[PDB]
Each structure stands twice: as C-alpha cells, then as structure tokens.
PDB file of C-alpha atoms and ligand atoms in Angstrom:
ATOM      1  CA  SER A   8       3.090  27.838  21.000  1.00 52.56           C
ATOM      2  CA  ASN A   9       4.161  25.179  18.305  1.00 53.66           C
ATOM      3  CA  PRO A  10       7.032  26.923  16.930  1.00 52.55           C
ATOM      4  CA  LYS A  11       7.994  23.913  14.723  1.00 51.17           C
ATOM      5  CA  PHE A  12       4.632  23.918  12.905  1.00 49.39           C
ATOM      6  CA  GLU A  13       4.470  27.734  12.786  1.00 50.55           C
ATOM      7  CA  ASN A  14       7.944  27.917  11.179  1.00 49.86           C
ATOM      8  CA  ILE A  15       6.918  25.519   8.586  1.00 50.16           C
ATOM      9  CA  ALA A  16       3.591  27.405   7.948  1.00 50.93           C
ATOM     10  CA  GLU A  17       5.666  30.664   7.497  1.00 52.28           C
ATOM     11  CA  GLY A  18       7.912  28.920   5.004  1.00 49.39           C
ATOM     12  CA  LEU A  19       5.031  27.963   2.911  1.00 47.72           C
ATOM     13  CA  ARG A  20       3.326  31.195   3.182  1.00 48.05           C
ATOM     14  CA  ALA A  21       6.339  33.097   1.945  1.00 48.25           C
ATOM     15  CA  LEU A  22       6.429  30.714  -1.089  1.00 50.67           C
ATOM     16  CA  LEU A  23       2.633  30.692  -1.702  1.00 51.72           C
ATOM     17  CA  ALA A  24       2.761  34.525  -1.421  1.00 46.32           C
ATOM     18  CA  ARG A  25       4.175  34.634  -4.960  1.00 47.23           C
ATOM     19  CA  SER A  26       1.096  33.470  -6.293  1.00 46.63           C
ATOM     20  CA  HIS A  27      -2.500  34.990  -6.269  1.00 44.29           C
ATOM     21  CA  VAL A  28      -4.525  32.074  -7.849  1.00 46.42           C
ATOM     22  CA  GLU A  29      -7.919  31.157  -6.666  1.00 47.04           C
ATOM     23  CA  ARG A  30      -8.165  28.669  -3.736  1.00 47.06           C
ATOM     24  CA  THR A  31     -11.946  28.209  -3.605  1.00 50.59           C
ATOM     25  CA  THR A  32     -14.864  28.008  -6.005  1.00 50.22           C
ATOM     26  CA  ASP A  33     -18.529  28.866  -5.714  1.00 50.46           C
ATOM     27  CA  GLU A  34     -19.352  25.291  -6.323  1.00 48.04           C
ATOM     28  CA  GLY A  35     -17.099  24.200  -3.121  1.00 44.67           C
ATOM     29  CA  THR A  36     -16.367  20.968  -4.533  1.00 44.21           C
ATOM     30  CA  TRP A  37     -13.191  18.926  -3.851  1.00 41.06           C
ATOM     31  CA  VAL A  38     -11.921  18.173  -7.311  1.00 37.98           C
ATOM     32  CA  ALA A  39      -7.832  18.376  -7.014  1.00 38.44           C
ATOM     33  CA  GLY A  40      -5.440  17.630  -4.306  1.00 38.09           C
ATOM     34  CA  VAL A  41      -1.679  17.064  -3.546  1.00 39.61           C
ATOM     35  CA  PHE A  42      -0.685  13.631  -2.494  1.00 41.35           C
ATOM     36  CA  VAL A  43       2.479  14.090  -0.164  1.00 38.90           C
ATOM     37  CA  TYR A  44       4.555  11.133   0.782  1.00 43.06           C
ATOM     38  CA  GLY A  45       8.115   9.882   1.831  1.00 45.33           C
ATOM     39  CA  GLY A  46      10.479  11.464   4.104  1.00 44.44           C
ATOM     40  CA  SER A  47       9.777   9.972   7.577  1.00 47.31           C
ATOM     41  CA  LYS A  48       6.542   9.713   9.355  1.00 47.25           C
ATOM     42  CA  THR A  49       7.467  12.692  11.682  1.00 47.12           C
ATOM     43  CA  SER A  50       8.605  14.904   8.973  1.00 47.92           C
ATOM     44  CA  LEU A  51       5.461  14.407   7.070  1.00 48.13           C
ATOM     45  CA  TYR A  52       3.547  14.944  10.321  1.00 48.05           C
ATOM     46  CA  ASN A  53       5.263  18.181  10.742  1.00 47.62           C
ATOM     47  CA  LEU A  54       4.491  19.234   7.055  1.00 50.69           C
ATOM     48  CA  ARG A  55       0.822  18.536   7.477  1.00 51.65           C
ATOM     49  CA  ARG A  56       0.415  20.668  10.659  1.00 53.57           C
ATOM     50  CA  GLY A  57       2.187  23.599   8.710  1.00 53.26           C
ATOM     51  CA  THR A  58       0.123  23.073   5.652  1.00 54.75           C
ATOM     52  CA  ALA A  59      -3.147  23.214   7.919  1.00 53.72           C
ATOM     53  CA  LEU A  60      -1.928  26.847   9.333  1.00 56.48           C
ATOM     54  CA  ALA A  61      -0.954  28.045   6.043  1.00 57.73           C
ATOM     55  CA  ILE A  62      -3.652  27.097   4.022  1.00 56.38           C
ATOM     56  CA  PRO A  63      -7.261  27.306   5.780  1.00 53.76           C
ATOM     57  CA  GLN A  64      -8.948  26.518   2.494  1.00 55.10           C
ATOM     58  CA  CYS A  65      -7.508  22.892   2.233  1.00 52.15           C
ATOM     59  CA  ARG A  66      -8.513  19.673   3.804  1.00 52.34           C
ATOM     60  CA  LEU A  67      -6.139  16.990   5.103  1.00 50.11           C
ATOM     61  CA  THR A  68      -6.071  13.359   5.753  1.00 49.93           C
ATOM     62  CA  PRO A  69      -4.327  11.941   8.597  1.00 49.19           C
ATOM     63  CA  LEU A  70      -1.108  10.223   7.730  1.00 50.11           C
ATOM     64  CA  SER A  71      -1.396   6.574   6.492  1.00 47.78           C
ATOM     65  CA  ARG A  72       0.985   4.074   5.026  1.00 48.76           C
ATOM     66  CA  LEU A  73       1.710   3.366   1.217  1.00 46.80           C
ATOM     67  CA  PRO A  74       1.631  -0.106  -0.192  1.00 45.41           C
ATOM     68  CA  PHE A  75       4.610  -1.461  -2.328  1.00 46.10           C
ATOM     69  CA  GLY A  76       4.911  -1.086  -5.758  1.00 48.94           C
ATOM     70  CA  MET A  77       6.583  -3.590  -8.234  1.00 46.48           C
ATOM     71  CA  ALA A  78       9.320  -5.908  -7.184  1.00 45.92           C
ATOM     72  CA  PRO A  79      12.188  -6.274  -9.643  1.00 46.06           C
ATOM     73  CA  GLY A  80      13.130  -9.724 -10.829  1.00 46.18           C
ATOM     74  CA  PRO A  81      11.036 -12.805 -11.406  1.00 46.40           C
ATOM     75  CA  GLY A  82      10.050 -13.526  -7.849  1.00 47.83           C
ATOM     76  CA  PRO A  83       6.560 -12.780  -6.232  1.00 46.70           C
ATOM     77  CA  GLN A  84       4.949  -9.462  -6.342  1.00 43.41           C
ATOM     78  CA  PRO A  85       3.870  -8.030  -3.046  1.00 46.26           C
ATOM     79  CA  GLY A  86       0.008  -8.733  -2.437  1.00 45.19           C
ATOM     80  CA  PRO A  87      -2.168  -5.500  -2.742  1.00 46.97           C
ATOM     81  CA  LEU A  88      -2.701  -5.021   0.920  1.00 47.20           C
ATOM     82  CA  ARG A  89       1.013  -5.363   2.004  1.00 42.37           C
ATOM     83  CA  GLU A  90       2.018  -2.107   3.832  1.00 41.26           C
ATOM     84  CA  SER A  91       5.234  -0.340   3.638  1.00 43.16           C
ATOM     85  CA  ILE A  92       6.977   1.919   6.220  1.00 43.91           C
ATOM     86  CA  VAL A  93       6.535   4.890   3.693  1.00 43.38           C
ATOM     87  CA  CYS A  94       3.790   7.204   4.715  1.00 38.45           C
ATOM     88  CA  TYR A  95       1.589   9.700   3.016  1.00 39.96           C
ATOM     89  CA  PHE A  96      -1.162  12.181   3.341  1.00 39.29           C
ATOM     90  CA  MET A  97      -3.594  13.761   0.914  1.00 42.30           C
ATOM     91  CA  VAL A  98      -4.448  17.427   0.752  1.00 40.09           C
ATOM     92  CA  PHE A  99      -7.903  18.079  -0.741  1.00 38.19           C
ATOM     93  CA  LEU A 100      -8.447  21.405  -2.726  1.00 43.05           C
ATOM     94  CA  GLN A 101     -11.134  23.105  -4.605  1.00 48.58           C
ATOM     95  CA  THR A 102      -8.992  24.335  -7.525  1.00 45.75           C
ATOM     96  CA  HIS A 103      -6.444  22.511  -9.637  1.00 46.13           C
ATOM     97  CA  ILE A 104      -4.577  25.884 -10.242  1.00 46.18           C
ATOM     98  CA  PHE A 105      -3.836  26.075  -6.710  1.00 43.71           C
ATOM     99  CA  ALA A 106      -2.928  22.538  -6.328  1.00 42.97           C
ATOM    100  CA  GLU A 107      -0.124  23.016  -8.864  1.00 42.49           C
ATOM    101  CA  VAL A 108       0.935  26.138  -6.869  1.00 45.90           C
ATOM    102  CA  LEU A 109       1.026  24.189  -3.494  1.00 52.00           C
ATOM    103  CA  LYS A 110       2.874  21.084  -5.230  1.00 53.46           C
ATOM    104  CA  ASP A 111       5.510  23.574  -6.380  1.00 54.36           C
ATOM    105  CA  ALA A 112       5.609  25.280  -2.808  1.00 53.47           C
ATOM    106  CA  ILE A 113       6.300  22.153  -0.982  1.00 54.87           C
ATOM    107  CA  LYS A 114       8.983  20.943  -3.421  1.00 55.63           C
ATOM    108  CA  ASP A 115      10.701  24.275  -3.018  1.00 57.51           C
ATOM    109  CA  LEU A 116      10.299  24.167   0.781  1.00 58.61           C
ATOM    110  CA  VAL A 117      11.668  20.664   1.592  1.00 59.17           C
ATOM    111  CA  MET A 118      14.669  20.802  -0.750  1.00 60.91           C
ATOM    112  CA  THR A 119      16.133  23.524   1.471  1.00 60.91           C
ATOM    113  CA  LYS A 120      15.991  21.033   4.610  1.00 57.20           C
ATOM    114  CA  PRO A 121      18.263  18.181   5.663  1.00 54.98           C
ATOM    115  CA  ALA A 122      17.267  14.493   5.161  1.00 53.00           C
ATOM    116  CA  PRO A 123      14.876  13.059   5.838  1.00 53.58           C
ATOM    117  CA  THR A 124      12.582  15.913   5.023  1.00 57.28           C
ATOM    118  CA  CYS A 125      14.292  16.608   1.583  1.00 61.34           C
ATOM    119  CA  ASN A 126      13.158  13.094   0.527  1.00 59.01           C
ATOM    120  CA  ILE A 127       9.527  14.029   0.826  1.00 60.65           C
ATOM    121  CA  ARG A 128       7.872  13.707  -2.555  1.00 59.08           C
ATOM    122  CA  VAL A 129       4.674  15.430  -3.897  1.00 62.13           C
ATOM    123  CA  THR A 130       2.365  15.065  -6.898  1.00 62.84           C
ATOM    124  CA  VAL A 131      -0.655  16.835  -7.887  1.00 59.83           C
ATOM    125  CA  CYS A 132      -3.848  14.724  -8.278  1.00 61.87           C
ATOM    126  CA  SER A 133      -7.416  15.090  -9.616  1.00 59.14           C
ATOM    127  CA  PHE A 134     -10.708  13.313  -8.708  1.00 63.09           C
ATOM    128  CA  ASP A 135     -12.882  12.980 -11.685  1.00 65.73           C
ATOM    129  CA  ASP A 136     -16.080  13.303  -9.889  1.00 67.92           C
ATOM    130  CA  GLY A 137     -14.832  15.050  -6.866  1.00 67.96           C
ATOM    131  CA  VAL A 138     -14.696  13.865  -3.354  1.00 69.48           C
ATOM    132  CA  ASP A 139     -17.776  14.511  -1.187  1.00 71.43           C
ATOM    133  CA  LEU A 140     -16.042  15.272   1.910  1.00 69.73           C
ATOM    134  CA  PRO A 141     -18.704  15.073   4.876  1.00 70.56           C
TER     135      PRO A 141
ATOM    136  CA  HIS B   2     -17.053 -22.194  -3.938  1.00 70.92           C
ATOM    137  CA  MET B   3     -19.039 -22.723  -0.706  1.00 72.12           C
ATOM    138  CA  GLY B   4     -17.714 -22.387   2.569  1.00 72.95           C
ATOM    139  CA  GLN B   5     -18.569 -24.383   5.844  1.00 72.90           C
ATOM    140  CA  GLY B   6     -22.248 -24.176   6.498  1.00 72.61           C
ATOM    141  CA  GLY B   7     -23.238 -22.772   2.941  1.00 74.90           C
ATOM    142  CA  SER B   8     -21.630 -19.389   3.591  1.00 77.49           C
ATOM    143  CA  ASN B   9     -18.767 -17.303   2.327  1.00 78.13           C
ATOM    144  CA  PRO B  10     -17.308 -14.288   4.014  1.00 77.92           C
ATOM    145  CA  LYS B  11     -18.464 -10.976   2.621  1.00 79.36           C
ATOM    146  CA  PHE B  12     -15.042 -10.098   1.275  1.00 83.15           C
ATOM    147  CA  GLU B  13     -14.927 -13.446  -0.622  1.00 82.19           C
ATOM    148  CA  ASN B  14     -18.355 -12.715  -2.094  1.00 84.12           C
ATOM    149  CA  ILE B  15     -17.100  -9.152  -3.017  1.00 85.32           C
ATOM    150  CA  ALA B  16     -14.074 -10.661  -4.781  1.00 86.38           C
ATOM    151  CA  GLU B  17     -16.302 -12.748  -6.886  1.00 88.14           C
ATOM    152  CA  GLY B  18     -18.671 -10.209  -7.530  1.00 86.85           C
ATOM    153  CA  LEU B  19     -15.806  -8.105  -8.851  1.00 88.29           C
ATOM    154  CA  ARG B  20     -14.408 -10.694 -10.913  1.00 85.99           C
ATOM    155  CA  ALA B  21     -17.497 -11.153 -12.664  1.00 85.65           C
ATOM    156  CA  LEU B  22     -18.057  -7.552 -13.522  1.00 86.56           C
ATOM    157  CA  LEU B  23     -14.427  -7.187 -14.516  1.00 87.31           C
ATOM    158  CA  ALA B  24     -14.350 -10.004 -16.867  1.00 87.35           C
ATOM    159  CA  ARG B  25     -16.624  -7.962 -19.110  1.00 90.41           C
ATOM    160  CA  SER B  26     -13.892  -5.544 -19.887  1.00 90.11           C
ATOM    161  CA  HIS B  27     -10.495  -6.718 -21.666  1.00 91.10           C
ATOM    162  CA  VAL B  28      -8.561  -3.478 -20.824  1.00 89.82           C
ATOM    163  CA  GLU B  29      -4.900  -3.224 -19.928  1.00 88.66           C
ATOM    164  CA  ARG B  30      -4.055  -3.177 -16.133  1.00 86.55           C
ATOM    165  CA  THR B  31      -0.386  -2.730 -16.505  1.00 89.93           C
ATOM    166  CA  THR B  32       2.130  -0.695 -18.729  1.00 87.89           C
ATOM    167  CA  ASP B  33       5.831  -1.189 -19.661  1.00 86.03           C
ATOM    168  CA  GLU B  34       6.702   1.904 -17.612  1.00 84.39           C
ATOM    169  CA  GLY B  35       5.087   0.354 -14.574  1.00 85.73           C
ATOM    170  CA  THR B  36       4.071   3.682 -12.943  1.00 85.38           C
ATOM    171  CA  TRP B  37       1.294   4.198 -10.616  1.00 87.57           C
ATOM    172  CA  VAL B  38      -0.470   6.919 -12.485  1.00 89.83           C
ATOM    173  CA  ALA B  39      -4.310   6.234 -11.663  1.00 88.73           C
ATOM    174  CA  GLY B  40      -6.498   5.306  -8.887  1.00 89.71           C
ATOM    175  CA  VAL B  41      -9.813   4.842  -7.312  1.00 89.11           C
ATOM    176  CA  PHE B  42     -10.757   6.697  -4.376  1.00 87.90           C
ATOM    177  CA  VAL B  43     -13.249   4.573  -2.377  1.00 88.07           C
ATOM    178  CA  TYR B  44     -14.997   6.256   0.852  1.00 89.01           C
ATOM    179  CA  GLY B  45     -18.349   6.348   2.976  1.00 90.31           C
ATOM    180  CA  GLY B  46     -20.458   3.358   3.971  1.00 90.59           C
ATOM    181  CA  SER B  47     -19.108   2.115   7.147  1.00 90.48           C
ATOM    182  CA  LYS B  48     -15.466   0.936   8.403  1.00 93.50           C
ATOM    183  CA  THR B  49     -16.819  -2.698   8.265  1.00 89.89           C
ATOM    184  CA  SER B  50     -18.228  -2.269   4.652  1.00 93.11           C
ATOM    185  CA  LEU B  51     -15.110  -0.827   3.506  1.00 94.11           C
ATOM    186  CA  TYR B  52     -12.980  -3.317   5.210  1.00 95.25           C
ATOM    187  CA  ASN B  53     -14.869  -6.116   3.225  1.00 92.69           C
ATOM    188  CA  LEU B  54     -14.640  -4.126  -0.037  1.00 95.87           C
ATOM    189  CA  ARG B  55     -10.928  -3.475   0.473  1.00 92.90           C
ATOM    190  CA  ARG B  56     -10.216  -7.126   1.258  1.00 89.48           C
ATOM    191  CA  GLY B  57     -12.226  -8.260  -1.700  1.00 88.81           C
ATOM    192  CA  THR B  58     -10.618  -5.923  -4.118  1.00 90.50           C
ATOM    193  CA  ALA B  59      -7.212  -7.094  -3.193  1.00 89.73           C
ATOM    194  CA  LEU B  60      -8.273 -10.729  -3.550  1.00 86.96           C
ATOM    195  CA  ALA B  61      -9.834 -10.029  -7.003  1.00 89.30           C
ATOM    196  CA  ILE B  62      -7.116  -7.658  -8.568  1.00 89.23           C
ATOM    197  CA  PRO B  63      -3.362  -8.585  -8.118  1.00 86.45           C
ATOM    198  CA  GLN B  64      -2.273  -5.761 -10.349  1.00 87.58           C
ATOM    199  CA  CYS B  65      -3.466  -3.145  -7.876  1.00 85.49           C
ATOM    200  CA  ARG B  66      -2.060  -1.689  -4.663  1.00 88.32           C
ATOM    201  CA  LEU B  67      -4.256  -0.480  -1.792  1.00 88.97           C
ATOM    202  CA  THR B  68      -3.704   1.935   1.117  1.00 88.25           C
ATOM    203  CA  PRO B  69      -4.960   0.946   4.612  1.00 84.85           C
ATOM    204  CA  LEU B  70      -8.381   2.263   5.650  1.00 83.68           C
ATOM    205  CA  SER B  71      -8.040   5.803   6.953  1.00 87.13           C
ATOM    206  CA  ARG B  72     -10.292   8.834   7.737  1.00 86.40           C
ATOM    207  CA  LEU B  73     -11.563  11.751   5.855  1.00 85.07           C
ATOM    208  CA  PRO B  74     -11.434  15.484   6.871  1.00 82.67           C
ATOM    209  CA  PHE B  75     -14.728  17.422   6.958  1.00 83.99           C
ATOM    210  CA  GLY B  76     -15.471  19.740   3.941  1.00 85.74           C
ATOM    211  CA  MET B  77     -17.467  22.862   4.547  1.00 89.59           C
ATOM    212  CA  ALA B  78     -17.875  23.926   8.254  1.00 90.95           C
ATOM    213  CA  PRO B  79     -15.787  21.373   9.995  1.00 91.77           C
ATOM    214  CA  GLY B  80     -16.727  20.099  13.538  1.00 91.52           C
ATOM    215  CA  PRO B  81     -15.167  21.343  16.587  1.00 93.01           C
ATOM    216  CA  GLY B  82     -11.634  20.595  17.881  1.00 94.89           C
ATOM    217  CA  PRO B  83      -8.525  22.213  19.392  1.00 97.80           C
ATOM    218  CA  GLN B  84      -6.483  22.226  16.157  1.00 98.30           C
ATOM    219  CA  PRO B  85      -7.010  24.028  12.743  1.00101.11           C
ATOM    220  CA  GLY B  86     -10.138  23.170  10.739  1.00 99.57           C
ATOM    221  CA  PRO B  87      -8.158  21.586   7.742  1.00102.46           C
ATOM    222  CA  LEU B  88      -6.990  18.807  10.337  1.00101.44           C
ATOM    223  CA  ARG B  89     -10.226  17.911  11.870  1.00100.49           C
ATOM    224  CA  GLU B  90     -11.124  14.230  11.219  1.00100.14           C
ATOM    225  CA  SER B  91     -14.621  12.939  10.407  1.00101.38           C
ATOM    226  CA  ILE B  92     -15.936   9.483  11.323  1.00103.58           C
ATOM    227  CA  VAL B  93     -16.084   8.630   7.551  1.00100.76           C
ATOM    228  CA  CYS B  94     -13.269   6.238   6.319  1.00 97.80           C
ATOM    229  CA  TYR B  95     -11.659   5.829   2.900  1.00 95.91           C
ATOM    230  CA  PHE B  96      -9.150   3.863   1.126  1.00 97.61           C
ATOM    231  CA  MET B  97      -7.231   4.210  -2.138  1.00100.03           C
ATOM    232  CA  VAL B  98      -6.584   2.020  -4.959  1.00 98.68           C
ATOM    233  CA  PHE B  99      -3.315   2.573  -7.024  1.00 98.63           C
ATOM    234  CA  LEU B 100      -3.304   1.410 -10.702  1.00 98.72           C
ATOM    235  CA  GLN B 101      -1.024   1.460 -13.670  1.00100.47           C
ATOM    236  CA  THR B 102      -3.710   2.557 -16.364  1.00100.62           C
ATOM    237  CA  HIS B 103      -6.363   5.040 -16.433  1.00104.10           C
ATOM    238  CA  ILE B 104      -8.718   2.802 -18.301  1.00102.98           C
ATOM    239  CA  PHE B 105      -8.659   0.116 -15.737  1.00102.34           C
ATOM    240  CA  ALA B 106      -9.438   2.777 -12.832  1.00103.11           C
ATOM    241  CA  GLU B 107     -12.565   3.678 -14.999  1.00103.63           C
ATOM    242  CA  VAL B 108     -13.504   0.077 -15.245  1.00101.43           C
ATOM    243  CA  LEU B 109     -12.944  -0.494 -11.484  1.00100.75           C
ATOM    244  CA  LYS B 110     -14.790   2.521 -10.489  1.00102.82           C
ATOM    245  CA  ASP B 111     -17.800   1.247 -12.465  1.00101.29           C
ATOM    246  CA  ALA B 112     -17.577  -2.249 -11.171  1.00103.25           C
ATOM    247  CA  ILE B 113     -17.508  -1.025  -7.395  1.00102.38           C
ATOM    248  CA  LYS B 114     -20.382   1.238  -7.958  1.00101.76           C
ATOM    249  CA  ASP B 115     -22.273  -1.465  -9.649  1.00103.12           C
ATOM    250  CA  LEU B 116     -21.545  -4.048  -7.074  1.00 99.47           C
ATOM    251  CA  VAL B 117     -22.418  -1.982  -4.007  1.00 99.98           C
ATOM    252  CA  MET B 118     -25.689  -0.950  -5.338  1.00 96.08           C
ATOM    253  CA  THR B 119     -26.593  -4.661  -5.056  1.00 98.50           C
ATOM    254  CA  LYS B 120     -25.756  -4.782  -1.327  1.00 97.75           C
ATOM    255  CA  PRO B 121     -27.642  -3.562   1.673  1.00 98.36           C
ATOM    256  CA  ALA B 122     -27.035  -0.371   3.590  1.00100.71           C
ATOM    257  CA  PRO B 123     -24.482   0.706   4.454  1.00100.08           C
ATOM    258  CA  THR B 124     -22.499  -0.836   1.789  1.00103.38           C
ATOM    259  CA  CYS B 125     -24.661   0.607  -0.825  1.00101.65           C
ATOM    260  CA  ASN B 126     -23.829   4.130   0.536  1.00101.58           C
ATOM    261  CA  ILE B 127     -20.079   3.844  -0.452  1.00101.41           C
ATOM    262  CA  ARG B 128     -18.896   6.265  -3.000  1.00 98.78           C
ATOM    263  CA  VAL B 129     -16.017   5.943  -5.564  1.00 96.86           C
ATOM    264  CA  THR B 130     -14.297   8.340  -8.064  1.00 97.68           C
ATOM    265  CA  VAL B 131     -11.382   7.868 -10.325  1.00101.25           C
ATOM    266  CA  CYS B 132      -8.382   9.786  -9.576  1.00 98.33           C
ATOM    267  CA  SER B 133      -5.111  10.554 -11.529  1.00 97.05           C
ATOM    268  CA  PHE B 134      -1.515  11.441 -10.299  1.00 96.81           C
ATOM    269  CA  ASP B 135       0.097  13.923 -12.655  1.00 96.56           C
ATOM    270  CA  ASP B 136       3.801  12.842 -11.724  1.00 95.36           C
ATOM    271  CA  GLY B 137       2.777   9.165 -10.480  1.00 94.13           C
ATOM    272  CA  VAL B 138       3.270   7.806  -7.141  1.00 94.27           C
ATOM    273  CA  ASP B 139       6.619   6.160  -6.563  1.00 94.70           C
ATOM    274  CA  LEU B 140       5.318   3.262  -4.325  1.00 90.68           C
ATOM    275  CA  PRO B 141       8.215   1.859  -2.511  1.00 90.29           C
TER     276      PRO B 141
HETATM  277  C1  KW1 C 201       0.215   6.969  10.890  1.00 86.46           C
HETATM  278  C2  KW1 C 201       0.203   8.374  11.600  1.00 86.46           C
HETATM  279  O1  KW1 C 201       1.167   9.054  11.716  1.00 86.46           O
HETATM  280  N1  KW1 C 201       0.887  10.320  12.260  1.00 86.46           N
HETATM  281  C3  KW1 C 201      -0.387  10.139  12.458  1.00 86.46           C
HETATM  282  N2  KW1 C 201      -1.319  11.140  13.135  1.00 86.46           N
HETATM  283  C4  KW1 C 201      -2.105  12.024  12.326  1.00 86.46           C
HETATM  284  O2  KW1 C 201      -2.089  12.043  11.084  1.00 86.46           O
HETATM  285  C5  KW1 C 201      -2.934  13.047  13.158  1.00 86.46           C
HETATM  286  S1  KW1 C 201      -3.199  12.585  14.794  1.00 86.46           S
HETATM  287  C6  KW1 C 201      -3.965  11.082  14.993  1.00 86.46           C
HETATM  288  C7  KW1 C 201      -2.934   9.787  15.426  1.00 86.46           C
HETATM  289  O3  KW1 C 201      -1.683  10.113  15.290  1.00 86.46           O
HETATM  290  O4  KW1 C 201      -3.420   8.666  15.917  1.00 86.46           O
HETATM  291  C8  KW1 C 201      -0.937   8.933  12.046  1.00 86.46           C
HETATM  292 BR1  KW1 C 201      -2.795   8.581  11.984  1.00 86.46          BR
HETATM  293  O1  60Q C 202      10.096  18.927  10.388  1.00 87.37           O
HETATM  294  C1  60Q C 202      10.276  18.773   9.178  1.00 87.37           C
HETATM  295  O2  60Q C 202      10.856  17.671   8.926  1.00 87.37           O
HETATM  296  C2  60Q C 202       9.943  19.623   8.072  1.00 87.37           C
HETATM  297  C3  60Q C 202       8.921  19.086   7.278  1.00 87.37           C
HETATM  298  C4  60Q C 202       8.630  19.967   6.182  1.00 87.37           C
HETATM  299  C5  60Q C 202       9.176  21.039   5.916  1.00 87.37           C
HETATM  300  C6  60Q C 202      10.027  21.675   6.811  1.00 87.37           C
HETATM  301  C7  60Q C 202      10.578  20.843   7.753  1.00 87.37           C
HETATM  302  N1  60Q C 202      11.499  21.294   8.404  1.00 87.37           N
HETATM  303  C8  60Q C 202      12.630  20.719   8.932  1.00 87.37           C
HETATM  304  C9  60Q C 202      13.462  21.424   9.735  1.00 87.37           C
HETATM  305  C10 60Q C 202      12.823  22.756   9.888  1.00 87.37           C
HETATM  306  C11 60Q C 202      11.610  22.489   9.044  1.00 87.37           C
END
C-alpha cells in the first residue's frame, strides 16, 4: 500500500540480487554498517523505508542531523554540537562484505534519480567492538 | 572551578574529567586532509546520562563534531510495531562523535570508558566503540 517505499525496495532488491554474499553470522553481532546522508530529509526517509523492506537482516536508526565540518578561512570553527540541515541514518549489518554490497547498491540506485535523491552519499563503516543493539 | 553553592553541572564535571584523561595522550587530533574518517559510537545508559556526556565531550574537545542524541533499533527479535522489523526503535539512545584521526578515536573511547566507570548508574552503563568510515563523512 506504500508504492513509493516498495518501488525503492524493488530497485534495491534488483541490484542486490547480483550478489550472494552472507548477510548474517552465527555470532549475530553488529560489526559493520552503511552510513547514508545528504540528499534531503524526505529522500533519505524514503530510502530508509525501502532499505527496511529489501533487507530484513539489517537494522536502521531513525534519521538524525549531521554536525558541520571544518569552515574555510581563519574565522571561527563551528562548535562540536552545532547541527546542520543535512540528515543521515545508519544501517547496522552483521557482515562487512554485505555492507560493501549495500553501499554499492545504494550508490547505483540513487544516481538514476533526479535531485535531490542523486545527492545522497554513502560510506561503509565498521565498529571495532560491535554495537550491542538492545 | 566551583559553581555557586559548591557544585558544578554534571556536563562540566564530565568535561574536566575527560580533559584530565586525554592530557595523558599526546596524539594527533587533526590531519592536513581534514577528513572525518574515524569516530566513537556512544550508547546506552539513559537519555540524561548521554545528554551530559555529549555536552561534556563537546566542551572538552573542540576538534570533534557530534550528532544529536537519537535512538537505536533492536537487535535480534525486535519488539512489536506496524512497520518492518529493521525500523523498530528501542528506548536506548546513542550519539556519534566524528574525528579526523583513528588514534584519537581510540584514546577518546578509552577515556569515555574510564570516566563512566567512576559514575553511578545509569551513567556507568554507557557503552562505546570506535568506528571508522571507509570513504570518510563529508560533513557540511
Ligand atoms: C529527523 C527525522 O526525519 N525523519 C524522521 N523519522 C524517522 O526517522 C522515523 S519516524 C519518527 C519521527 O519522524 O519522529 C526523523 Br526522527
Ligand atoms: O524518494 C526518493 O527520493 C528516492 C530515494 C532513494 C532512492 C530512490 C528514490 N526515488 C526517487 C524517485 C523514485 C525513487
């Protein structure tokens, strides 16, 4: 009944179908992920809903906001708590190999869409000691 | 320093405790590249204890950048909800710290672990792990 989220799910599934790497481990620990950001709040939200449908094996944070980076010039840097309008969400995964596959699928999916969707960025991330999701 | 009535806010005391621990480690906090390639992922405790830790971390460390507080999903066997399992939100909170160096992320992870162990529950239940971002995060 949510055609927008289902159409994103189908786009992701079509891309993820090219790979057969393991998505879970016997340990079940959350040791990798994909960090997804930019675009717009709504385009990220839509991508998050489609990711949830396409990947039952992942876990997702809500959207939240990124802080600023470095400011050019000699003027003051932003304080560490200052929030931008750029949003992000995190995908938690049990294998790094599937994180890499998902990162590539998200990149390939969003580049076929108009702005602001094509401005979504993604990087793999790893958690040294894992994240003990509750 | 001592505030009115012989008390400081918890976040100020966190900042001072972190400053003391971090002074033990003379490691690089920035790079010429300036890229945000490392982090610490801080979670658990309670919303109030994380609130104080986040505010104290900011005060102690100008070289870092912090997300707001937010919520974690469940791991195995999520709780109920009308939406898919991967989206269901627990009551456990988290924040992230972005950093320019891997070594300082390690030092900060150790400092937070050491500091929260000296506090009463629920602060001592806060968890932390280093993280790394393969391609960096292009903070705005
Ligand atoms: C910021 C922001 O932008 N969209 C969001 N929603 C979710 O991530 C899932 S629904 C909960 C809600 O929206 O309050 C949030 Br939080
Ligand atoms: O809704 C979005 O912005 C979106 C997000 C991620 C991937 C595809 C999307 N899309 C865009 C048009 C049709 C699908």
